[PDB]
Amino acid sequence: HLNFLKKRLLQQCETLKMEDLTNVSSLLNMERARDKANEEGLALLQEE
Amino acid sequence: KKRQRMIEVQDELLRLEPQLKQLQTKYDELKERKSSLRNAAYFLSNLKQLYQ
């Protein structure tokens, strides 16, 4: 099964970050949470 | 939205200045026009109604 897994490697690597993608995706997730907070702030302040 | 907020406040600052000037004019015109004639045209004619 390990030989076949090296085969999977050789099979999809040829055809075609992750830890950084996960961390920066979460970071941008709370950044956009802070962003919708700024949106409700700015939109409501502009509305008043 | 923040640029729109600055533009609206710029209108709101201009609106505030215009409303302040308009209300000052409103109070001045109210006093002058409404009370002058009701006092001058009253009294000047009442003085005429008195003397003449």
Dist CA A41 CA A35 (whole Å): 9
Judging contacts by C-beta atoms under 8 Å, the chain B residues touching residue A39 are 1
In a mutational test of the B interface, the residue from A42, A46, A47, A48 whose CB has the highest number of chain B CBs within 10 Å is A46
Q: Measure A47 CA to nearest chain B CA, in Å.
A: 9
What one-character DSSP code corresponds to residue B6? H
Query: 10 Å Cβ neighbour count for B38?
Result: 10
Within 8 A by CB and 6+ apart from B1, the residues are A39, A42, A43, A46
**Resolution of this entry, Å:** 3.3
